[PDB]
Design a protein around this ligand. Structure first.
Ligand SMILES: O=c1[nH]c(-c2ccc(-c3nnn[nH]3)cc2)c(-c2ccc(F)cc2)cc1O
Ligand SMILES: [Mn+2]
Ligand SMILES: [Mn+2]
Ligand SMILES: [Mn+2]
Length: 200
């Protein structure tokens, strides 16, 4: 088949909110999304996984964790997760500082991706084109000391999470894996996958 542009794929296969947040992040770190395109696609993918990870998860009227897939349910429900990824540095740290002071949890040395109000911990999300165990160690070794939970996804369906604690139900994580599989397949049909995979 013909080789598509990764740019076209990103703009066609991710919603504009994701794409825009991704562009802003790259600009913020001095990289151009029209040159570092594999990174661009990687950043969109990871951002989307972060959103999908928190999607539908609330804390109920009685204070336990429930799943609602409509927009019509109860406004007394609190989102289970705080989303840190996707915010600019100032706002991300503002949110982290707020959480840390409120909940009394320890302040992380690097920006995490999520905060989980049920488990009372920050989460580092990872999405890798390599084997999950290797990438996990790379994360584990950057965060140094840990209260921060790590959860790694691959494009081939493997997961690895701290202490074999996977946080979410199988259905939630299946949605994420299916999306990753779909991204991989679509890249492959445009002959973007091999280049993307080898670039990590
Ligand atoms: O696990 C993460 N990961 C990443 C991440 C994403 C892509 C690459 C990448 N892809 N190709 N070269 N570098 C590296 C780290 C990022 C990230 C997000 C926005 C941004 F502007 C820069 C980095 C954030 C994460 O939490
Ligand atoms: Mn970031
Ligand atoms: Mn992050
Ligand atoms: Mn991450």
């Amino acid at each position: 088949g013909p080789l598509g542009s990764m740019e076209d794929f990103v703009r066609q296969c991710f919603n504009p909110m994701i794409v825009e947040l991704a562009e802003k992040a790259m600009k913020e770190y001095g990289e151009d999304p029209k040159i570092e395109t594999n990174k661009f696609a990687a950043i969109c993918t990871h951002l989307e996984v972060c959103f999908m990870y928190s999607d539908f998860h609330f804390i109920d009227e009685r204070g336990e964790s429930i799943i609602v897939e409509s927009g019509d349910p109860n406004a007394l429900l609190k989102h289970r997760f705080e989303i840190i990824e996707g915010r600019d540095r100032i706002m991300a740290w503002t949110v982290v500082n707020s959480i840390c002071n409120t909940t009394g949890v320890e302040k992380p040395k690097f920006l995490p991706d999520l905060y989980d109000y049920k488990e009372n911990r920050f989460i580092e999300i990872g999405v890798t084109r390599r084997e999950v165990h290797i990438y996990y160690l790379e994360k584990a070794n950057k965060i140094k000391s840990e209260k921060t939970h790590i959860h790694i996804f691959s494009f081939t369906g493997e997961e690895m999470a701290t202490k074999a604690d996977y946080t979410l139900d199988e259905e939630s994580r299946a949605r994420i894996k299916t999306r990753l599989f779909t991204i991989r397949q679509e890249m492959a049909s445009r002959s973007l996958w091999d280049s993307f995979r080898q670039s990590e």
